CSV table of all heavy atoms in Angstrom, one decimal:
chain,number,residue,atom,x,y,z
A,82,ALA,N,6.2,-9.5,7.7
A,82,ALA,CA,5.1,-8.8,8.4
A,82,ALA,C,5.1,-7.4,8.5
A,82,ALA,O,4.1,-6.8,8.7
A,82,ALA,CB,4.9,-9.4,10.0
A,83,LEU,N,6.4,-6.9,8.1
A,83,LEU,CA,6.5,-5.5,8.1
A,83,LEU,C,6.2,-4.8,6.8
A,83,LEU,O,6.3,-3.6,6.6
A,83,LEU,CB,8.1,-5.0,8.4
A,83,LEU,CG,8.6,-5.5,9.8
A,83,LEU,CD1,10.0,-5.2,9.9
A,83,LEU,CD2,7.8,-4.8,10.8
A,84,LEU,N,5.7,-5.7,5.8
A,84,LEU,CA,5.3,-5.1,4.5
A,84,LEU,C,3.8,-5.1,4.4
A,84,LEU,O,3.3,-4.7,3.4
A,84,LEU,CB,5.9,-6.1,3.3
A,84,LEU,CG,7.6,-6.3,3.4
A,84,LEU,CD1,7.9,-7.0,2.1
A,84,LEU,CD2,8.2,-4.9,3.3
A,85,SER,N,3.0,-5.4,5.5
A,85,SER,CA,1.5,-5.4,5.4
A,85,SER,C,1.1,-4.1,5.0
A,85,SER,O,1.6,-3.0,5.3
A,85,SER,CB,1.0,-5.9,6.6
A,85,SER,OG,-0.5,-6.0,6.6
A,86,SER,N,0.0,-3.9,4.5
A,86,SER,CA,-0.8,-2.8,4.4
A,86,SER,C,-1.3,-2.3,5.7
A,86,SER,O,-1.7,-1.1,5.8
A,86,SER,CB,-1.9,-2.9,3.4
A,86,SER,OG,-3.0,-3.9,3.8
A,87,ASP,N,-1.4,-3.2,6.8
A,87,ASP,CA,-1.7,-2.8,8.1
A,87,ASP,C,-0.4,-2.5,8.8
A,87,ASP,O,0.5,-3.3,8.8
A,87,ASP,CB,-2.4,-4.0,8.8
A,87,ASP,CG,-2.6,-3.9,10.4
A,87,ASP,OD1,-2.3,-2.9,10.9
A,87,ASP,OD2,-3.1,-4.7,10.9
A,88,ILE,N,-0.2,-1.2,9.3
A,88,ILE,CA,1.0,-0.8,9.8
A,88,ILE,C,1.3,-1.1,11.3
A,88,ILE,O,2.3,-0.7,11.8
A,88,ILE,CB,1.3,0.7,9.8
A,88,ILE,CG1,0.4,1.5,10.7
A,88,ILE,CG2,1.2,1.2,8.2
A,88,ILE,CD1,0.8,3.0,10.8
A,89,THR,N,0.5,-1.9,11.9
A,89,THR,CA,0.5,-2.3,13.2
A,89,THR,C,1.9,-2.8,13.6
A,89,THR,O,2.6,-2.3,14.6
A,89,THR,CB,-0.6,-3.3,13.7
A,89,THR,OG1,-1.8,-2.7,13.5
A,89,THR,CG2,-0.4,-3.5,15.2
A,90,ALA,N,2.4,-3.8,12.9
A,90,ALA,CA,3.7,-4.5,13.3
A,90,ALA,C,4.8,-3.5,13.0
A,90,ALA,O,5.8,-3.7,13.9
A,90,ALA,CB,3.8,-5.8,12.4
A,91,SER,N,4.9,-2.8,12.0
A,91,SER,CA,5.9,-1.8,11.9
A,91,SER,C,6.0,-0.9,13.1
A,91,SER,O,7.0,-0.5,13.6
A,91,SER,CB,5.7,-1.1,10.6
A,91,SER,OG,6.2,-1.9,9.4
A,92,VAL,N,4.9,-0.3,13.5
A,92,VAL,CA,4.7,0.6,14.5
A,92,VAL,C,5.2,0.0,15.8
A,92,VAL,O,6.0,0.7,16.6
A,92,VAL,CB,3.3,1.2,14.7
A,92,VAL,CG1,3.3,2.0,16.0
A,92,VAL,CG2,3.0,2.3,13.5
A,93,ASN,N,4.6,-1.1,16.2
A,93,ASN,CA,5.0,-1.8,17.3
A,93,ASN,C,6.6,-2.0,17.5
A,93,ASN,O,7.2,-2.0,18.4
A,93,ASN,CB,4.3,-3.0,17.6
A,93,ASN,CG,2.8,-2.8,18.1
A,93,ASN,OD1,2.6,-1.7,18.4
A,93,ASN,ND2,2.1,-3.9,17.9
A,94,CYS,N,7.2,-2.5,16.3
A,94,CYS,CA,8.6,-2.7,16.4
A,94,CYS,C,9.3,-1.3,16.4
A,94,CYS,O,10.4,-1.3,17.1
A,94,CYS,CB,9.0,-3.5,15.0
A,94,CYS,SG,10.7,-4.0,15.0
A,95,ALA,N,8.9,-0.3,15.7
A,95,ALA,CA,9.5,1.0,16.0
A,95,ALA,C,9.4,1.6,17.2
A,95,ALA,O,10.5,2.4,17.6
A,95,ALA,CB,8.8,2.1,15.0
A,96,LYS,N,8.5,1.1,18.1
A,96,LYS,CA,8.5,1.8,19.4
A,96,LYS,C,9.6,1.2,20.2
A,96,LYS,O,10.1,1.8,21.1
A,96,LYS,CB,7.1,1.4,20.1
A,96,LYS,CG,6.0,2.4,19.6
A,96,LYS,CD,4.8,1.8,20.2
A,96,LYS,CE,3.6,2.8,19.9
A,96,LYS,NZ,2.2,2.3,20.3
A,97,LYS,N,9.9,-0.1,20.0
A,97,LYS,CA,11.0,-0.8,20.7
A,97,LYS,C,12.4,-0.3,20.2
A,97,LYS,O,13.4,0.1,21.0
A,97,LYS,CB,11.0,-2.4,20.5
A,97,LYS,CG,12.0,-3.1,21.2
A,97,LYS,CD,11.7,-4.6,21.2
A,97,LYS,CE,12.8,-5.4,21.8
A,97,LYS,NZ,12.4,-6.3,22.8
Side-chain angles (χ1 to χ4, degrees):
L83 299 178
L84 303 187
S85 177
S86 57
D87 172 0
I88 68 167
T89 301
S91 283
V92 164
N93 284 349
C94 186
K96 283 175 181 180
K97 184 174 172 123

